[PDB]
Structures are given as structure tokens and as C-alpha cells.
Swiss-Prot record, chains A, B:
PTM comment: Palmitoylated. Depalmitoylated upon L-glutamate stimulation.
UniProt source species: Rattus norvegicus (Rat)
Induction: Down-regulated in the pyramidal cell layer of CA1 in the hippocampus by global ischemia.
Range of the intact protein held here: 414 to 794 of 883
Name of this chain's protein: Glutamate receptor 2
Self-association state and partner proteins as the record states: Homotetramer or heterotetramer of pore-forming glutamate receptor subunits. Tetramers may be formed by the dimerization of dimers. May interact with MPP4. Forms a ternary complex with GRIP1 and CSPG4. Interacts with ATAD1 in an ATP-dependent manner. ATAD1-catalyzed ATP hydrolysis disrupts binding to ATAD1 and to GRIP1 and leads to AMPAR complex disassembly. Interacts with GRIP2. Interacts with GRIP1. Interacts with NSF via its C-terminus. Interacts with CACNG2, PICK1 and GRIP2. Interacts with GRIA1 and SYNDIG1. Part of a complex containing GRIA2, NSF and NAPA and/or NAPB.
Length: 258, 258
């Protein structure tokens, strides 16, 4: 009956509302994905319940245990019926779950503390004073791990061996490390969120260079789910109507602090 | 079973090779989609024949007969097994055919001669001296037809009633019209092509302003096709391998002549 939506607490997609403690259910959260979830449900005609993924991860398969974690995992093991989050459409994930066409287009990028002498990935690879890393269990980390491109492979070879760890558990943790490391730490994260942070006080971070790749986020459902077809048509319908662009402007730029 | 591939002669996606005269079959053509078709065929393990869409159209549904034309029509009516072309993933099309995840990200844009006083869509809508139109039977013409957004809607009302016709049969016709119109004609087409033409002699056109939307091109197969699954995963693999980006630079900028 009520569709269980797995999502992640990640600003500006899903965030705890100001006085959420005084509210119930879906009304406790606000964000791009909360707005989208409400629309996807309206158009597909289903009641739903927003839920925050238990392990706070996007989703990766543990080689060896072979168990999927994050939102991907909740879909795979049947804990949730659908995932509405900034979840990247990738091959290893599409092999175990279904994705609608993209609702947002983006790519990996470099976030620096303003003033950092770095202008590209090539710059990062060619040096060592400035450490750099990615978010722990997801598509960005897999991108470098699986890359055959010289620059990206050089970066992986360093990152995978760097001590202490250059990987962070969450985006907030990477942004903080960037802000606190006095230009000695750069962060590899998707452009959508790099751009978001660039507009939030203290306005001390910046996105540099072009995107490392081009890809998208999709609404995910368990393989062979009944919701798949309709959510995909809903996504296409809503993008064509301009809602998705309207929502990015709302959560990114209208609410800009810089 | 040799796979019949429907595609369209559209630079730099598919073009007749210089020495096509004494060449046969697939060898007669070259371009981004020619390499892409070879790549996907390789990964999906099938033999194929490139064939040019008979009516030279991307694909639109006649409102009276409800009959589909273009590459979409060839797929719907079983004249082709797969379409490998710069074909845009849209709702009306996704309803009759299947599309893999995007192999290219893009958006509708504005092509001006060069030196013409137009900075954006808003500019076009506020004047009458400079005529502007789109290509027929495709997603761009649909974008404006079904657009509730003030500027785009206003633009449609002008283009629809326009006399003479501001719509063109092919992208080649639109580019020629912009080039010969002494800046009195602006063309609405996708960013991918706008940026391609911008890098080709006589170097007299230019893309102005940002894209009007964000979408993607997908490899299309007829509903319930056996090829669907594999081609989708192959597209994902190729994008992640970095091949699509390799192909983009090859046919767009390495060959750039401006
Ligand atoms: C959001 C976000 O931003 N940078 C990132 O790596 C992520 C996580 C990424 N979207 C994933 O699905 O793994
Ligand atoms: C290519 C291209 O470039 N501008 C355009 O309108 C098109 C056609 C568009 N890709 C379609 O599928 O109709
Ligand atoms: Zn709605
Ligand atoms: Zn290959
Ligand atoms: Zn007719």
C-alpha cells in the first residue's frame, strides 16, 4: 500500500525541517527530493513514507561479503520500494536495480578552499602537498577505482594508499575538512553539490575546472518493480514541464547565501 | 540475425566518407554514431547494417493519422531493429519505443549568425525583425508546442503562425538559412549541433546564451525488443570507460576548424 521511499539526509535534497520535532511523518523533512517525491507520488498515484537510509550511504557492494549497502541495499534486500535521492545511475547498480531516465545531469568535480593553487585533476595528480579524496561508498569512489585514464589512475593510486584516509563518510564531512584544512585538502564530489556549497556561507569554497565526466541521477526501484514504468514517465513528464529546473533554482540559487 | 540500424545523415554523427564512391555497406559512413554503433555491436555481440532513415526525419506523430515518421516510425513499424542517432529521449517517444540511458547530455539552444543582436530566448520573443524557427518533426518543435513557460509559449505562437515558414527540414537547412539571412534568422537547435557548427568554417555562427533545457540522446529499440537490455548496459559501460567522451572530442574538437 504505502510506498516506502528510501532517501538520504543530504542538503539541499533532504534535510530535517527547522521544527521537525513538532511535526509528523513526511512533514518533518524539506528539500529538492522532498518536493520531487511529493510530485512523483501525485503523478503515479501512490501514498508514500519517506525514510532515511540506515547506514547513511549511497550504495556500494562489498567485494567479498558481496552485500550491497546504502540505499541500493535497501532496494535489493526489499527494505524499501523506491529511492528518491541524488543517486547516480551506474552500471554495477543498474545490474541490480532499475533507474528512471535522469532527473538531474552532472559530473564529478573538484572543490577547493579559495586560494588553493589547483585548477584541474591533472594538477592534483602532479602534486602531493594538497591531499584529496572522495566520498566513501558510491559512484565517485568507484570512478577512480575503475579508471583506465592515466590521470585518474594516478589519483586512485595515491588516494587508495594515502594515510591517514582521504575518504570521508559524508559530503558534509568532506566540505568541513576542506574548510578546516587551510587549502591542504581538495574534495572530489559531484558538481551539483559543489555548486550548492559554493553558495552557502562562509562562501570559502569553490568549484574548479570542468566536470570529470557526464552522468545523471535517477529514481531507483527494485528490479522488476511495478512502479518502474510510471515513475520513469513521471520523471520525463516533469522535466519537460520545467519542474526539475524550477526545483534546482529554488533549492540552489533562490536560497543562495553568497 | 543481422541487426538493421536506422540512423540519420547528420554531421558529425553520420556522414558519407570522402571516398564513399568505391566503398560499400557500413564502410561508406563515418562519424560519432558510426563508432558508437561499432562499439555497442561489439559489446552486445551482433552484426549490423547501417541504413539511413527513408524520410530523413527524427520522429514525430501525425496528429490526424497518429502515424509515426522518422527513425521513431521505422522502429514502431518494424522497419528497423535499433536507432543509433542523436535522437532525443522524450515522453511521447518513450511511450512507443524504448531508450537506453543517455549517451549524450544536451539542451535546446540559440544559433545566431554572428553580430546579430540576440542574447537569449527572452530577446527573440521581444522582437519581430529577426525571424527564428526550429527543425520539423522532432523534439525541439515539440518543446515549444507544449510549452507553458511565458517566453517559450510566446515564441511558439509566433513560430506556429509565422509566414513564410520558419521551420526547416534538416539541421543543414537551418544552418544555411542562418548563414544567408544576414542575421535576420536565428535557429533553435540542440547545443551539441550548435557547438559543432560553431567550430566549422566559415566560422560565422555562434551559440548564444545557455541551454533552454537539459536532456539526453538515447539509443532506441522497439518496445519489448530483445536488444534493449544489453544496449542499455553497453551505453553505461562505454560512458564509464570514457569512450563517449573520447568520441566527443574526436568528432567535435580534434576535428574543429575554427
Ligand atoms: C551526492 C554526491 O555528491 N558527490 C558524490 O559522490 C555523491 C554520491 C553519488 N551521487 C552516489 O550515488 O554515489
Ligand atoms: C540533432 C538535433 O539537433 N537539434 C535538433 O532539434 C535535433 C533533433 C532532435 N535530436 C530530435 O530527436 O528530434
Ligand atoms: Zn505535478
Ligand atoms: Zn569498447
Ligand atoms: Zn497529416
Amino acid at each position: 500500500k504505502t510506498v516506502v521511499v528510501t532517501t538520504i539526509l543530504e542538503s539541499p535534497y533532504v534535510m530535517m525541517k527547522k521544527n521537525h520535532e513538532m511535526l509528523e511523518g513526511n512533514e518533518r523533512y524539506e528539500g529538492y527530493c522532498v518536493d520531487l517525491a511529493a510530485e512523483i507520488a501525485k503523478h503515479c498515484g501512490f501514498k508514500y513514507k519517506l525514510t532515511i537510509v540506515g547506514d547513511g550511504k549511497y550504495g556500494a557492494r562489498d567485494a567479498d561479503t558481496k552485500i550491497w549497502n546504502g540505499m541500493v541495499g535497501e532496494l535489493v534486500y526489499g527494505k524499501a520500494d523506491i529511492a528518491i535521492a541524488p543517486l547516480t545511475i551506474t552500471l554495477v547498480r543498474e545490474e541490480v536495480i532499475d533507474f528512471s531516465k535522469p532527473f538531474m545531469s552532472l559530473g564529478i568535480s573538484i572543490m577547493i578552499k579559495k586560494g588553493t593553487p589547483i585548477e584541474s585533476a591533472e594538477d592534483l595528480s602532479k602534486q602531493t602537498e594538497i591531499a584529496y579524496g572522495t566520498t566513501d561508498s558510491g559512484s565517485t569512489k568507484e570512478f577512480f577505482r575503475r579508471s583506465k585514464i592515466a590521470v585518474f589512475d594516478k589519483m586512485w593510486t595515491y588516494m587508495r594508499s594515502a594515510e591517514p584516509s582521504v575518504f570521508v563518510r559524508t559530503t558534509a564531512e568532506g566540505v568541513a575538512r576542506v574548510r578546516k584544512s587551510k587549502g591542504k585538502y581538495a574534495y572530489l564530489l559531484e558538481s551539483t553539490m559543489n555548486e550548492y556549497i559554493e553558495q552557502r556561507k562562509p562562501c570559502d569554497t569553490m568549484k574548479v575546472g570542468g566536470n570529470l565526466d557526464s552522468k545523471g541521477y535517477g529514481i531507483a526501484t527494485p528490479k522488476g518493480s511495478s512502479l518502474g514504468n510510471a515513475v520513469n514517465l513521471a520523471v520525463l513528464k516533469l522535466n519537460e514541464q520545467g519542474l526539475l529546473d524550477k526545483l534546482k533554482n529554488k533549492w540552489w540559487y533562490d536560497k543562495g547565501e553568497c
